Amino acid sequence: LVPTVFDIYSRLLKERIVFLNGEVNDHSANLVIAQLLFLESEDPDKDIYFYINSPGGMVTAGMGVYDTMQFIKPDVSTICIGLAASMGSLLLAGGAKGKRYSLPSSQIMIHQPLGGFRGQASDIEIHAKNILRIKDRLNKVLAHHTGQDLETIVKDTDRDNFMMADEAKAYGLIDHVIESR
Amino acid sequence: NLVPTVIEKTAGERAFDIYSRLLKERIVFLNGEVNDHSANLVIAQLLFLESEDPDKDIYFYINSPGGMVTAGMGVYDTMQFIKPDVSTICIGLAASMGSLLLAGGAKGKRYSLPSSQIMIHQPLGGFRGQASDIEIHAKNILRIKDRLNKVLAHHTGQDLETIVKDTDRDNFMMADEAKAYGLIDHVIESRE
Amino acid sequence: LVPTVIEKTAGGERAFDIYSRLLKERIVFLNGEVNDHSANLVIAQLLFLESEDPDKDIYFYINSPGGMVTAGMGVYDTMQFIKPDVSTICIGLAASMGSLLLAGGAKGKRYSLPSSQIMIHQPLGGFRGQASDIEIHAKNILRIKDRLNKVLAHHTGQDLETIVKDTDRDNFMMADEAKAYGLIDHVIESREA
Amino acid sequence: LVPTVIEKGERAFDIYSRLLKERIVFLNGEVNDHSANLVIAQLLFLESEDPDKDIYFYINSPGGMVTAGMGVYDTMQFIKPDVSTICIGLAASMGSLLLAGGAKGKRYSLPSSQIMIHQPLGGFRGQASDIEIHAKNILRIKDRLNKVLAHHTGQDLETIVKDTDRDNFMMADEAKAYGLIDHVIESREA
Amino acid sequence: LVPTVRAFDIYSRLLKERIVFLNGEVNDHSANLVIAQLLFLESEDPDKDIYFYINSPGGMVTAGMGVYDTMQFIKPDVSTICIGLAASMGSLLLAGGAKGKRYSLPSSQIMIHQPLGGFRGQASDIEIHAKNILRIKDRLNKVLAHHTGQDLETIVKDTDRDNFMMADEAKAYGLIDHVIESRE
Amino acid sequence: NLVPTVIEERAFDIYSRLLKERIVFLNGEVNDHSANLVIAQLLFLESEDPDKDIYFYINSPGGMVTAGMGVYDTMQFIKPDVSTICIGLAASMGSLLLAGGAKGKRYSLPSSQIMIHQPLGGFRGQASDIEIHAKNILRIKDRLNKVLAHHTGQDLETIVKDTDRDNFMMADEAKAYGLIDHVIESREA
Amino acid sequence: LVPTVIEKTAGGERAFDIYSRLLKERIVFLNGEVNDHSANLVIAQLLFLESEDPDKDIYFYINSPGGMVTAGMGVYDTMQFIKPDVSTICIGLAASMGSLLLAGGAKGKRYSLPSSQIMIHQPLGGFRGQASDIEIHAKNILRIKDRLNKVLAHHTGQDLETIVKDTDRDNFMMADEAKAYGLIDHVIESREA
Amino acid sequence: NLVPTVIEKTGERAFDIYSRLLKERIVFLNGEVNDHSANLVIAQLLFLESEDPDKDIYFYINSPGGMVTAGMGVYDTMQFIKPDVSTICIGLAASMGSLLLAGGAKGKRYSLPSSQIMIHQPLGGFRGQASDIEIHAKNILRIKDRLNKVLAHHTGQDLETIVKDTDRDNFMMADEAKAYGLIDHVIESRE
Amino acid sequence: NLVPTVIFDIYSRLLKERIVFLNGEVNDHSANLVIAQLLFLESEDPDKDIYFYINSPGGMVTAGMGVYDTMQFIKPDVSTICIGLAASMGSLLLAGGAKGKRYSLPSSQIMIHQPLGGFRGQASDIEIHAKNILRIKDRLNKVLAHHTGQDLETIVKDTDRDNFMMADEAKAYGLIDHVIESREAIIK
Amino acid sequence: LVPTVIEKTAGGERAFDIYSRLLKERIVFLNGEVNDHSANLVIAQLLFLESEDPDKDIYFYINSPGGMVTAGMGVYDTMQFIKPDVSTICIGLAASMGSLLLAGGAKGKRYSLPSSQIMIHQPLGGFRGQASDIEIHAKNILRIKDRLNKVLAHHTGQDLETIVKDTDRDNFMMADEAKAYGLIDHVIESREA
C-alpha cells in the first residue's frame, strides 16, 4: 500500500507524472482524465508524462483518455513501462509527436476490438455494425499516429500482434526506446 | 409421476410405456424445448414410422417453446423428406421453432386445439470474440433469419415481407388467428 | 412375465407399477405442478384411453397447485376434444390451472373429496426487456386472463363479471363452497353413499 | 436397491408389491405430493382388488404437506375397505392425523412409537390484502383439522385446540388413552 | 454394483435364505426396507429364524425403534450378527436380537451412547423438545438394561459419553451372546 | 490506483479540486448513488455561484431512469447553465443527460459513442399488476421521447422511430441529430 | 484544515464531503432504500439541524423506493416532532414509504421536480410459522395498513375510503397528478419561476 | 449515503453527525443488538457519565433486539451509571429492544407516535447430546424468567401477566405500550 | 463405458467362477457387497476356494474388518490377489487371505501404514476417541504380524509412516505368498 | 427375450447392448480415463474372454488419455498373465497409461489407425504434508517412473536411456512415428490389408 512522502502518486502528480496501471475501465480512465485536466489547469504549456502499463480494456473509456490527450494544450509524452496492449497501445501511440517512448523490455501488442452481444438477430446486427465502425476508427487512429497505410494496420491487427520496443519504434507506435537517463 | 406401462399379453407378456404404445398408433410428440436430444428422438420416430409404413399419415403433436434452430431444422427437413404426410397438431404452445414445425406439417393437415398459443419471432443468438468473428456470426444469423422467414412464407402463403414485418418482435396468436394467417389449416375442438 | 413394482424409477423401466394398474381401470392422475412433462403425460394417457375405448368414462384425479398455463390448456383442450367423458375428482388441492382442469370435467361428473382445497386466481406472468416487448407480453397475458375467465364462466354457470371479481385475488374455497360456485358438481365422502 | 421376491408362470415383485398382495401399504418419511399420491394409488388399487377386505396402512412419517395428506385421509374414508393404521416409528403432524383417521377399533401402534400432534404451519409473503386471505385460509384449515382430530379421538374440540397449540409428544400408551389409536400391540401372539 | 445370481440380485437371493442386512445409516428408507423384509420373512414362514446382519453407525431414533419393535413383534426369532460397526441405534438393534442369538464377528466395533438431537425456536418449544429427548433417553436406557441384564443406573453411567467396546467386551456386557470366529 | 490529492492550506481529492473549477463528472452507471452525488454537486455549485457555468462531464452507459431523471431535472432547475461534455460514452440515460445540457453548450470529444434507445424494465406478478407496470413504462417511454424531441429539435415521430432499437452515433452524427451542439477536438477553437 | 472530498468512503473518515457541505445549508437527503441505516442517518441530521436552529426550514430531498416501515415511520414521526418545518422535495422516485415521507412534509412546502415518479401502495409483509403466529402478524400488518392510510388521508386531504381504494394496487403518478392528489403542493421546474 | 461531517472552527476539527450528537448527550441503538452494537452503547454511556455524572442521557432506540447477553449488559449499564437514561423509541423496539426501552429512567421513557413495540419470550437453539440439550434448556428458561421479571418491575404488571402476554409475539402501538407500562409518554411534538 | 452383458453382467458371470472383486474405496457399500458375495459363494459350495481380487486404497476400518472377519469365518479358503493397488485396509485384506494362497500381479503397489482418524469436541471425548484408535492400531498391527510372520515390533516400526512395497518386496515381507506373471509359469 | 439397446443406462440393466454384442467377437474397449472403474471392467472382460477361449486373440481397442497408474498397471499385468494374445488397436488417442497399454499388446499384434495420436511421458503425482512423507512419496514415484520406462524399453526395443530421454516431457507421435519407435507394429488403414 501507498507510502507517504502526500501519497507518492500525489507527489509524482505534482511533477506532471500520471500513471495508467492495469485495466482500462471507467474508473481508471476517468482518473487519468481528471489528472490531465488538473495538470493543464496548473500550467497549460508544460509537458505531461503519462506512464502506461496496461493490457487495455474498455474502448469507450479509453477513447475518452485518447481524446483528452489530444484536446488539452500540454504535449502528453507517453512512456511504456511494462505492457501496452490493445487500448494500452493505442494510448501509447497517441502520445505527442516525437514524445512517445518505451523502456527496452516492454511488450506492445496491437489487435482488433473484442466484443459480444446476445439477443435478437436485429440487435446482433446493430451491435456487429457498431464494433465494425469502432474497428475502422481505431485502425485509422493507429494509421495516423504510426504513419502506416490503413491496409497495413488492418492486416497487422487481424490477430494479436506482439512487438518488442524496437519493433514498435520501427513500426511507428513509438518514437524512442530509452535505456538510461 | 412418471410414464406408466401397458402390458400386452403374448402367446407370456411384453411391456410398453405410454409413448411407445402411442408410437404404434403413429403418434409422435415434441414436448418442451427443441435441442439435439429432443429433435433427434423425433427424427428417429419419423424414420421408424416411414419404415413401418411409407404411405400412412404420421400425427405429430407439438407443445414446444422452440429452442435450437439447427436441431429443429433437422426435424423440419425430415418431415418434408419422408414419404408419409406428417400432420401437425398444436396441443398447448407452438413458439419460435415450435411454430415453424407446426406450420411445416403436411398441406391441409396442420391443426390446433382451441386454446393453444402460437408465437412467431426472429431468431435469437449470441457470440463473443473478435470483431471479425462477430461479423461472421452476425452474417450467419441474418442468413438463418431470412431462411426461417422464407419457410414461414412458403407454408402460410404470406409474402416474405409480411413475415419479416410480423416477426420483428414476438407475435402471439390465438388458434383462430394462426389459421387466418396460414400457420395451420384447422382449429379443432371435438373429434365429433 | 413383466415384473410388478409400486412405482417405476424411470419412464422406460420394464415394470408394471401402481399407476399402470390403475390406468387399466381408466384412472389418470395429475399430481403436483402442471408443466410440459406432467401435462403431456396426462394428454398421452387420455389419448391412449380414448383409443382403447371411446365410449367409456375416464376418471381424472387431480391434486395440483397449477403451473404453466399453456401446458395446462393443452390438457383442458384434450379433455374436451376426446370422445370419452372425462370425470374429474379433486384429491387434495386444485389451485389455479388445477381448478380450471377440475372445473373443465364432463358435465355432472366433477367431484371433490370432502377436505380438498380449491383455489381460483388470475394468471401470473413476468417479462423483462424493452418497453415495446413488455407491452406485447402484457397484452397477451390480459387476453389469456380473459380467455380463462370465460372458460370458468362457461363451466361454472357464473356470469363473467362474477368470475372477474372473484379471481382478482387468490380465492380459496372448501369443497362445499366449490360445489355451490359451480366448479364441481358433487362432494363425495363414501363410495357407498 | 429394493429387494425382489419371485412368485409362481412366475412373476418378480419388489418387496413392497409383494407386501401389497397382503394388502399392506406404507407411508414412510415426509408427506408430499409424490408420497401421498403413491399411497392413494395403492388404496384405490386394493379397493379394486377387493372392496371388503381390510387394508393395513403402516405409518412412519413426520407429516408434511396438509393438502397432500388430506387427500390420503379422504381416500381412506372414501374407499369401502376398512383401513387399519399401524404406527411403526413416528406419526407426527399430518402423520398422526392419518394414524388417527384409521378405521374405528383398528388403529394400532407398536410400543416404542412417538406420536406428536400440533397446529398447522404455513407462510406467505406479499401485500397485506393477500396476507389476510392466506391467514384466514390457514385458520380455516386449523379448525377443520382440529374437528377431524376431535371426531376420531372422542375429545372435545376445545381440548384438541388446547393440546395442539404447541408440539405435543405422546408415547403409544398415551396416544391410546387420548383416542389417537385403539391398541398398543407388542407381539403378534398376544 | 450388485451382481446377479431363477435370476436374482445377490441380496434378493440371500433374502430367500432368511438373511437381512442393515448396512449404513439408520433412516426412514433403510429402516423401512428392513421392516418390509422382516414382515415378508414372517409371512413366508412364521417359525423359522431370521438372520439380521448389522453394520451401521445408527441414525434416526424413531426409524430405528420401528425396526426394534418389529423384531420383537413378529413370531420368528431374529438373530442379530454384527459384521463391522454397531454404534448408537445400530447397537440397540444388535442388543435387541433374540435371546441367546445375538452374535458378533471378532473384530467388530460396538458403541453405545445417549441420544443426539437439537432444536431452535422459542424457549417454550425448546423445553418441549428437551423434555421429549429426555424421555427418549430414559426409554432407550431401559431397552438396553432389559436386553443386557445391567441395572438401569449402569446403562445411564455407561452411555453418558460414547462408549466403545470390542466384541468380547460387548459379550461380557450383555449386548451380544456370542463372539463367533469360524463356522467350523 | 486510488484518488490523488491536491493541496492548495487544505487537501482536496482531485475531484474536489476540479469541483473548484465547477467541473462535475458522471462516470459509469447511473444509479441512486451516482445520480445523488451529481445532484449534490450541482446544488453545491449553484450555492457557490448561481450565475457561473457548470461543466458536466459524462461517460456513462446509462442505468436507472428515476435516478437519472432526478439529475436531468436538477440540471434544468438550478440557475447556472449546465454545459455537458461527452468524454467516452453517453448511452441511454447518459445520452439524455448529455442532450439535456444548456442550449449551445452541449459538447462531445471527437471519439465518443452516443447511443439512444427506448426504456428497459421488468416485472413479475399478477396480470393486473403486469398491466399497471406496463402502462407506467409506456408513459415513461413517451415522456423520455418528448424530452429528446425538445432538446434535439427532432419531431416526436422521428425520436420514436430512431429509439426503437439501440441507435449508435458518432459525435458528428449526434451533433447533426441535435443531441449536442459542438464536437471539440482542441482547446484552441 | 479538514480535507475536502466529493464523498466519504467511511462514516468516521476525517474529511468534509459534498453532503456535509449541503447539510450546512440545511439540506438532507434520503437516497435509495429506507432501512435502519438510512432512516437513522436522516433522523440524526434532522435532530442536529433542529439543535442548530429550531426556527429555520430544513429541505429534505427524497429519492427512494421505500423499504422498512418501522424505520421510515421514525423519520415521519421525527419530521412532525421537531420544531423546524421540514420541506420535502422529490428528486427522482418517491415510492411506498418514500411517498409517505414526501407527503408528510410541512403544509404548503412539499415539492417535486417535474419528471419524478411518485407511487403509493399498501404495505408488504411476510411471515412463516404456526397458524397462531401467522394470525398475530396478519392482524398487525392490517393495523399498520390502516394507520398508513390514515396518515396519507391526513396529508393529502383525501377521504380514507379514497386512499384505501387507490393504494390497493401499485398506483403510479406523475408529479402533476401527485399535486392534484395532494401528495405534494407544488411542481417546480426552475428556481427562478 | 454515509454519515456526514461537521467542521468546527477552532484551525478546524471534524466530527461525524453521531459524534456531534454525542456532545448533546444523545446515544443511538440502531438495528440488531449484538456484541458490537451493545458495547458501543455501553462505551458511550460510560463516556457521558465521565463527562457529567448528573446530566440526563437521551438513548434513542430503533431495534428488533438480538443477543440477550449483549443487551443485558446495556440494560445493566443504564441502571448502574449515575445519570438518568431517558429512552425514546423512534421506529421499532422489539424483543431486547423493548426491554431496553422499558428499562429507561422512571418517568423518562418515551415513544414517538407511530413506533412499533413488541414483547416476546426468548429465542434460542442448541444441538448435541440430550444432557447438554437439558443444560441449555434449563438456562434459557432461567433467562426467560429473568427477562419477564425485568419487564414486570419496570411496567408494574404482575409477573404472571408478563408471562401470559409474551408467550407469543405481542405487538403494541405506542399508546398501548404506555397503557401497559413499557413507556411513560407518547410524544408527537416538541412544542 | 459401463458393465457389459452375456446372454449376466460381466461381474455376475465371473462370480460363477467364484471370483469376487474389491475395487476402489472400502466403505459400507463396497464391503457389504463383498460380504454378501462370500456368504453366497459359501452357501453354494462350502468346500471350494474363493478368489478375491483386490484393487483398493483402503477406507473405513470397521467396514473392511467385517470383510476380514467374514474371510476367516466362512468355510471356503479365500485366496487373495492384488490386481493394482492394495493400500491400507486393502493390504490388510490381501494379507488376510488363506495361508499359501495370497498372490500379486508383478506391477502391483502394496502399501502399509497406521490408522487415520479424526475427531472434534470436548477434551473428554477426544480422549475416548484417541484411546479407541490406539486399540484399533494395535489390533491391526497384530493382524499383520500374524499373517506375515513378522514380529509385532517390526510391524509397528514399518507402519509408522506410509510404507510402499513392490510385489516382490511384499512377498519377502510375508504380505503375499507368490508373485505371478504368466498363468503358464510354474508357481514359485 | 433379452432386449437390444445401443447402450446400457446401468451396470445391472437387463439388456444386450452394442458392447456386449462386440464382446461376443472378443472386442474389448478402454475408452476415456483410466481409473479403478474403467480398469477393473477391462480386467473382468479379459478374464471372461480367457475362460470362453484360451487361444483366440482378444482385440483391445484403446482410446484413452491415461489416468491412474495402479489401476492401469493391473490391466497391463492381466494382459501379460492371461493365456490368449491381447492385440491392441489405437482408435483416437493413446496417451500416458494409454500408450503403455497400447505398447504392452501381444508381439506383432499392436496396431493403430492412421490418424491416432500417441503420447508418452513420465509419471505425474503429488503429495502434501511433512517433509518425511514427501520424501517417501517422491522415492516411490521415482521407482514407478523407472519401472514404467523399463516396460516401454522392453516392448519397444528402445534402450532404457532412449526411453528416459524421450519421456522427460510430453512426447506426441503420429501413428507412423509410433510404429517406427516400436510402440506399435502396424498402422492399418483398410480392412482389405
Numbering used by the authors:
A (entry chain P): 6 to 10, 21 to 196
B (entry chain M): 5 to 15, 17 to 197
C (entry chain N), G (entry chain U), J (entry chain K): 6 to 198
D (entry chain H): 6 to 13, 17 to 198
E (entry chain I): 6 to 10, 19 to 197
F (entry chain O): 5 to 12, 18 to 198
H (entry chain T): 5 to 14, 17 to 197
I (entry chain J): 5 to 11, 21 to 201
Q: What does the article say, verbatim?
A:
Caseinolytic proteases are large oligomeric assemblies responsible for maintaining protein homeostasis in bacteria and in so doing influence a wide range of biological processes. The functional assembly involves three chaperones together with the oligomeric caseinolytic protease catalytic subunit P (ClpP). This protease represents a potential target for therapeutic intervention in pathogenic bacteria. Here, we detail an efficient protocol for production of recombinant ClpP from Francisella tularensis, and the structural characterization of three crystal forms which grow under similar conditions.
One crystal form reveals a compressed state of the ClpP tetradecamer and two forms an open state. A comparison of the two types of structure infers that differences at the enzyme active site result from a conformational change involving a highly localized disorder‐order transition of a β‐strand α‐helix combination. This transition occurs at a subunit‐subunit interface.
